[PDB]
């Protein structure tokens, strides 16, 4: 992938002419990673990393010699100052040109004031000054883009070198340092703490070019207009503390809103997760009240912050007008006169110095502070204690063996008991040494000590030869299964096939789409734990090391796979290699040549399996311990009359802004056309003050109205979205995951609430300023409207051409960034396995390649932006040149005031044009959140909660249920679940529910509750379920679900959200459920907040709370669904007994996976794939062996079957025959 930048000349590099093929390809089709240009040799990660590493080591050595702390900042400066001085020269030149050009503007105006049509020398001089002005504009418009690209390239180089150094350090962190730190911190100081270097270098050179430009501008202003410039300078200086105060208050007002936003998001997550339980209980009104209160509380603070930001923007808009008004008011009041060669030079100088003082200097200060903080963080990281490099090995005879003598060490030096107590043993090739012990013995500690991870406090360890080590937890890195097995070594087909066959990985390969080439992500999302363990063992065997160390290889695999592995990949293959193995299964101890028993870090016994059998101590014994989007977004805010008023306000503000400068020009012309007689100062100064006041007030009003309208639109959209969500049927929640649902409530609404209104206001402001500049230029010289049409057409086509490729470049850069973090995380998690072999330089090379693949896209991201900016600035410079030369060509018509006004506005169009284009692009990007919110606004809605026809309040009187021809489908067009169910449930009868694991037992409650609209007729106390609203039907039947859920709140809230009961009644219910004494010992009597689903409460406690809820509701129809699954027998018996005794006179339908709980039921439904087979007493079903009830009873066993039959017979005899 050759880089055309390596070929281009200086002329092509100035205009970025070498990116045209890339833009052509991007316009034609989509851009993939194969279309990117490889980085230049000087920008490769390894080169920069090694250069900065050498400089940093030299600085460290010097600092240690001098005996002070080292300075990463000093190292970086010593490395990059020579390359960062030339950019300083160029920014000096650029700032000098910026300061210079108003002088030539004033010279042109001065020529216009002393016009003489017959003179030609003055015309020639004016043309020369115009040429110099065009040269200055070209300098500011053309070369600045190459300068900016190099400025950003410096920061990119710094960041790449920093990342390389950080990874190189992290690859050799000691055990204690790794215990201090975490993987998250190391990933964070690459994802967030290294990106400050991209931004520090942009504004770094302004720390000396800001005050210098301010001083030069002040000197020029004093030379031009006199002492009156001090008032404008004072106002400009005062402008900074106002910004500081605004930013200080805005941060507090913003941080005061997260405490409501996070609570709202947490409640939303709870609602979305437990939507089925809420719908069954009909608590949507309570949750709606809670969410509404939280939203209002957050919206108040959002409104306050928006008002503050609008005031800040209005202050920026009116600052220049205020400065100029004050300056020229004191200038005129001191006794001078108004002239166009001075007014419109002071205006331009004030504008330039105001931009520089207000924005660039504070931005530079902030970026430098952040970069210093990040540098200090990385500097602290780079001095963590590192593992001492494996020193010169003791001279041996080349034999491969492992020996340990008198070893004693501890991970922590403050521990009372050492990790290992005087270990002393040796192992030779061909010996299968096994270590057997309980959890915590220290077998993995012994293996780590052999590897060298445990620093020997006392004793000696002699290990020679290559090492094969198997971690307790299998590890898979960012690659493929073939890559995992190869571990970077050269691929051999025969050896790979031999290892695959020996490891029985053929089934795992066949289970994958690509087989052995399938990509496995972080933590093996595409694989399983057994596959990871098999891959780890295969890699260890394939690497073909002299010494093999194993640690818990077969704990998490099946019996056949474990036996086949332990035999054919260890006993035969590794019979020529040194082997030390850690076991937990006793069946593999027979094949072990050596066995050691370890407990409490102390040696117990070592010998063969026969010797241990003769010892008499049992191992087992020892092992037991579009446009419509904009239209709807604007309509949701306010009426269209408000839109008309907003348009009028914007127009009035811009008109006053222009008219103040026009009035200055008119004053200058009227003073010039005079004669002593004097101008009436009262009139002119009064009109000036009125125009300034009107500009300020109109700007403030426009900003406030825009902000309020857009925030109201966001609030209305959120209300509509939540209202729609609360009524969507369960099918919608089944289709969409919880994360997707919560994303539109967390991120999209977050954008709409704070970012979009302010972005819109800024874009409108800048666009109106550009329109005003163009309108002034057209009004002064009408002929300028001719080339404006070609310029607009060219701009539109160029914008389309650029945007067809910029988005692809941005997505490529976004998708090429995560592999770096994934590789870092994988290498950090498998650091011991990486360091076991000598392959860490290969991991460094892989990381370098991953970093290069991202710098590949960053380069394009910078260059395409510069490519667009060059042409935009060319268009703007053409406009400026046209104005400046047409004014001189038509000198017989215009006058000084008009010429100066038009020329100054043409000069100020710069930067504003580019910012307007960028903000338009950003707004178009941001509208997708509004699109998604509006999409969720109009979801499908289920039946209304209430109907016109209301049943009597006493219904259900008895509780008789009729099922007639019930066909149930979860989704329309999906498979049928229930097939023509026909049954009658008499009042106050206990019915048990039986069938297979997919018989549809839990599908009956959905039909009864009408969660999904069923087909057929269901009659309850002679009312059909399809002619009454859902909230009037679900409220009269109680449900006890499989997994109880408790919502975060008070116990009174959890037991009675609608305050329909009394505290005494709730206490009586709690006493009935025997949880009252547990309730009344917390810090609060009944208002104790809980965690998610009551994480501090037991499962039995949650079931008991659900039973208490059912008791409190005290409805006639009770349904229980899979009550006891993994609860203790005591709580199971408690729940069964309480349910049996408390609801004697209430109809109960119970679905139980076990027949023990539902043996005493009066009747039993038999379900076969949604077909109702048998409905009668359980004794009758057990009488006939052909019944499915008898078959399932016999499936359980014999003794339990006999007990169940006896219990059913006893129940039948007691009930039917009293
Ligand atoms: C304090 C007074 C004043 O604001 C300073 C100062 C001047 N302003 C007047 C308008 C203005 C600004 N530049 C201009 C350049 C030419 C002509 C006019 C202007 C700007 C500003 O503030 O315009 C409101 C500004 C704004 C944003 C900006 C960068 C920027 O100047 C460099 N961004 C770059 O990406 C955006 C931002 O979102 C971002 O960086 O996002 C990752 C940014 O947020 C952060 C955290 O930086 C911000 C502004 C804080 C926040 C919300 C909305 N977005 C829209 C554009 C952007 C802005 C700077 C007045
Ligand atoms: N890397 C480590 N850092 C800190 N403590 C450790 C480390 N490795 C082991 N230990 C401690 O050393 C003691 C014994 O470890 P060890 O028994 O090898 O762990 P184990 O493998 O989970 N149990 P076992 O399988 O019987 O060896 C325990 O107190 C561990 O917490
Ligand atoms: N939301 C759903 N959408 C579509 N089919 C479903 C859904 N939930 C369950 N099913 C299937 O519909 C059939 C009805 O079985 P089901 O409702 O689970 O009763 P059950 O299995 O006997 N009781 P349980 O095992 O506790 O769920 C089964 O084949 C389920 O897999
Ligand atoms: Mg261990
Ligand atoms: Mg079910």
Curated annotation (Swiss-Prot):
- State what inhibits or activates this protein: GSH stimulates the transport of MRP4. Urate inhibits methotrexate transport but stimulates cGMP transport. Nonsteroidal anti-inflammatory drugs (NSAIDs) strongly suppress the transport of MRP4 substrates.
Where in the cell?
Basolateral cell membrane; Apical cell membrane
Where's the ABC transporter domain? 402-625, 961-1194
Q: In which tissues is it expressed?
A: Widely expressed, with particularly high levels in prostate, but is barely detectable in liver. sinusoidal membrane of hepatocytes.
Keyword Zinc-finger attributed: no
Task: Quote the InterPro entries the UniProt record gives.
Answer: AAA+_ATPase, ABC1_TM_dom, ABC1_TM_sf, ABC_transporter-like_ATP-bd, ABC_transporter-like_CS, ABC_transporter_C-like, ABCC4_TMD1, ABCC4_TMD2
Superkingdom as given in the UniProt entry? Eukaryota
Membrane topology category: Multi-pass membrane protein
Q: Which residues form the ABC transmembrane type-1 domain?
A: 84-369, 643-925
Pfam families recorded = ABC_membrane (PF00664), ABC_tran (PF00005)
Record function comment: ATP-dependent transporter of the ATP-binding cassette (ABC) family that actively extrudes physiological compounds and xenobiotics from cells. Transports a range of endogenous molecules that have a key role in cellular communication and signaling, including cyclic nucleotides such as cyclic AMP (cAMP) and cyclic GMP (cGMP), bile acids, steroid conjugates, urate, and prostaglandins. Mediates the ATP-dependent efflux of glutathione conjugates such as leukotriene C4 (LTC4) and leukotriene B4 (LTB4) too.
Annotated family: Belongs to the ABC transporter superfamily. ABCC family. Conjugate transporter (TC 3.A.1.208) subfamily.
Query: What is this protein's name?
Result: ATP-binding cassette sub-family C member 4
């Amino acid at each position: 992938k050759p880089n055309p930048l390596q070929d281009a000349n200086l002329c092509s590099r100035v205009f970025f002419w070498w990116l045209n093929p890339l833009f052509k390809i991007g316009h034609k089709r989509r851009l993939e990673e194969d279309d990117m240009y490889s980085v230049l040799p000087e920008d490769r990660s390894q080169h920069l990393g090694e250069e900065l590493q050498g400089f940093w080591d030299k600085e460290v050595l010097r600092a240690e010699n001098d005996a002070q702390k080292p300075s990463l900042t000093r190292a970086i400066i010593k490395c990059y100052w020579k390359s960062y001085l030339v950019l300083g020269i160029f920014t000096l030149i650029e700032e000098s040109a910026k300061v210079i050009q108003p002088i030539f503007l004033g010279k042109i105006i001065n020529y216009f004031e002393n016009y003489d049509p017959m003179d030609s020398v003055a015309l020639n001089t004016a043309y020369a000054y115009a040429t110099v002005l065009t040269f200055c504009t070209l300098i500011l418009a053309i070369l600045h883009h190459l300068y900016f690209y190099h400025v950003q390239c410096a920061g990119m180089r710094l960041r790449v070198a920093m990342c390389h150094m950080i990874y190189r350090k992290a690859l050799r962190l000691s055990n204690m340092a790794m215990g201090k730190t975490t993987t998250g911190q190391i990933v964070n100081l690459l994802s967030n703490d290294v990106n400050k270097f991209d931004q520090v270098t942009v504004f770094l050179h302004f720390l000396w070019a800001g005050p210098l430009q301010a001083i030069a501008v002040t000197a020029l202003l004093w030379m031009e207009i006199g002492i009156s410039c001090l008032a404008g300078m004072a106002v400009l200086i005062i402008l900074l503390p106002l910004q500081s105060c605004f930013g200080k208050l805005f941060s507090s007002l913003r941080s005061k809103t997260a405490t409501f936003t996070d609570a709202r998001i947490r409640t939303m997550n709870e609602v979305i997760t437990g939507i089925r339980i809420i719908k069954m209980y009909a608590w949507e009104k309570s949750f709606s009240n809670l969410i509404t209160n939280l939203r209002k509380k957050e919206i108040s603070k959002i409104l306050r912050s928006s008002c503050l930001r609008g005031m800040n923007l209005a202050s920026f808009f009116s600052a220049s007008k205020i400065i100029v008004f004050v300056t020229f008011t004191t200038y005129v009041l001191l006794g001078s006169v108004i002239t166009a060669s001075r007014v419109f030079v002071a205006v331009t100088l004030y504008g330039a110095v105001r931009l520089t003082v207000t924005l660039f200097f504070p931005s530079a200060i902030e970026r430098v502070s952040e970069a210093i903080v990040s540098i200090r963080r990385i500097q602290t990281f780079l001095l963590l204690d590192e593992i001492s490099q494996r020193n010169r090995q003791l001279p041996s005879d080349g034999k491969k063996m492992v020996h340990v003598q008198d070893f004693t060490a501890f991970w922590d030096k403050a521990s009372e008991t050492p990790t290992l107590q005087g270990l002393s043993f040796t192992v030779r090739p061909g010996e299968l040494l096994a270590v057997v012990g309980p959890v915590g013995a220290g077998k993995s500690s012994l293996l780590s000590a052999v590897l060298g991870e445990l620093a020997p406090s006392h004793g000696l360890v002699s290990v020679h030869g290559r090492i094969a080590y198997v971690s307790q937890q299998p590890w898979v890195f960012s690659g493929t299964l073939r890559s995992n097995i190869l571990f970077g070594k050269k691929y051999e087909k025969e050896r790979y096939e031999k290892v695959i066959k020996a490891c029985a990985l053929k089934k795992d390969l066949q289970l994958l789409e690509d087989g052995d080439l399938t990509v496995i992500g972080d933590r093996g999302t595409t694989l399983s734990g057994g596959q990871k363990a098999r891959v780890n063992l295969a890699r260890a065997v394939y690497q073909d090391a002299d010494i093999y160390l194993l640690d818990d290889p077969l704990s998490a695999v099946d019996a056949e796979v474990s036996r086949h592995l332990f035999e054919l990949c260890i006993c035969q293959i590794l019979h020529e290699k040194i082997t030390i193995l850690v076991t937990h299964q006793l069946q593999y101890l027979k094949a072990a040549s050596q066995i050691l028993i370890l407990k409490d870090g102390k040696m117990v016994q070592k010998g063969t399996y026969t010797e241990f059998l003769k010892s008499g101590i049992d191992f087992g014994s020892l092992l037991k311990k579009g446009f419509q989007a904009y239209k709807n977004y604007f309509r949701a805010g306010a009426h269209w009359i408000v839109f008309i008023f907003l348009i009028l306000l914007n127009t009035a503000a811009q008109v006053a802004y222009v008219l103040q400068d026009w009035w200055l020009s008119y004053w200058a012309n009227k003073q010039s056309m005079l004669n002593t007689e004097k101008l009436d100062l009262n009139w002119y100064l009064g009109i000036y003050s009125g125009l300034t006041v009107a500009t300020v007030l109109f700007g403030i009003a426009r900003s406030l109205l825009v902000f309020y309208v857009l925030v109201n639109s966001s609030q209305t959209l959120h209300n509509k979205m939540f209202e729609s969500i609360l009524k969507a049927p369960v099918l919608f929640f089944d289709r969409n995951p919880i994360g997707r649902i919560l994303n539109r409530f967390s991120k999209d609404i977050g954008h709409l609430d704070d970012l979009l209104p302010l972005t819109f206001l800024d874009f409108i402001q800048t666009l109106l300023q550009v329109v005003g500049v163009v309108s002034v230029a057209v009004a002064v010289i009408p002929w300028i409207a001719i080339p404006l049409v070609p310029l607009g057409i060219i701009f539109i086509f160029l914008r389309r051409y650029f945007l067809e490729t910029s988005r692809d470049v941005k997505r490529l850069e976004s998708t090429t960034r995560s592999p770096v973090f994934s590789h870092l995380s994988s290498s950090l998690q498998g650091l011991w396995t990486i360091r076991a072999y000598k392959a860490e330089e290969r991991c460094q090379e892989l990381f370098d390649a991953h970093q290069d693949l991202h710098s590949e896209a960053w380069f394009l991201f910078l260059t395409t932006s510069r490519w667009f900016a060059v042409r935009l600035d060319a268009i703007c410079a053409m406009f400026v040149i046209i104005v400046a030369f047409g004014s001189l060509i038509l000198a017989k018509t215009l006058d000084a005031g008009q010429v100066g006004l038009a020329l100054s506005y043409a000069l100020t169009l710069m930067g504003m044009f580019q910012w307007c284009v960028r903000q338009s692009a950003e707004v178009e990007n941001m509208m997708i959140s509004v699109e998604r919110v509006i999409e969720y606004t109009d979801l499908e809605k289920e039946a209304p909660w209430e109907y016109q026809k209301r049943p009597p309040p006493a219904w259900p009187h008895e509780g008789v249920i009729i099922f007639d021809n019930v066909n149930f489908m979860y989704s329309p067009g999906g498979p049928l679940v229930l097939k023509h169910l026909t049954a009658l449930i008499k009042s106050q009868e206990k019915v048990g529910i039986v069938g297979r694991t997919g018989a549809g037992k839990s599908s009956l409650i959905s039909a009864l509750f009408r969660l999904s609209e069923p087909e057929g007729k269901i009659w309850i106390d002679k009312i059909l379920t399809t002619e009454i609203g859902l909230h009037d039907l679900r409220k009269k039947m109680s449900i006890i679900p499989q997994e109880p859920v408790l919502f975060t709140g008070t116990m009174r809230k959890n037991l009675d959200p609608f305050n329909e009961h009394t505290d005494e009644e709730l206490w009586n219910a709690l006493q009935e459920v025997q949880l009252k004494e547990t309730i009344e010992d917390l810090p609060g009597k009944m208002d104790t907040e809980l965690a998610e689903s009551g994480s501090n409460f037991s499962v039995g406690q949650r079931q008991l709370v659900c039973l208490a809820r059912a008791i409190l509701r005290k409805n006639q129809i009770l349904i229980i669904d899979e009550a006891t699954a993994n609860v203790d027998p005591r709580t199971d018996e408690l729940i069964q007994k309480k349910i049996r005794e408390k609801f004697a006179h209430c109809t109960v339908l119970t679905i139980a996976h076990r027949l023990n709980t539902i043996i005493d039921s009066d009747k039993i439904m038999v379900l076969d794939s949604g077909r109702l087979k048998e409905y009668d007493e359980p004794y009758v079903l057990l009488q006939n062996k052909e019944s499915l009830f008898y078959k399932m009873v016999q499936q359980l066993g014999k003794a339990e079957a006999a007990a169940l039959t006896e219990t059913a017979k006893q129940v039948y005899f007691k009930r039917n025959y009293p």
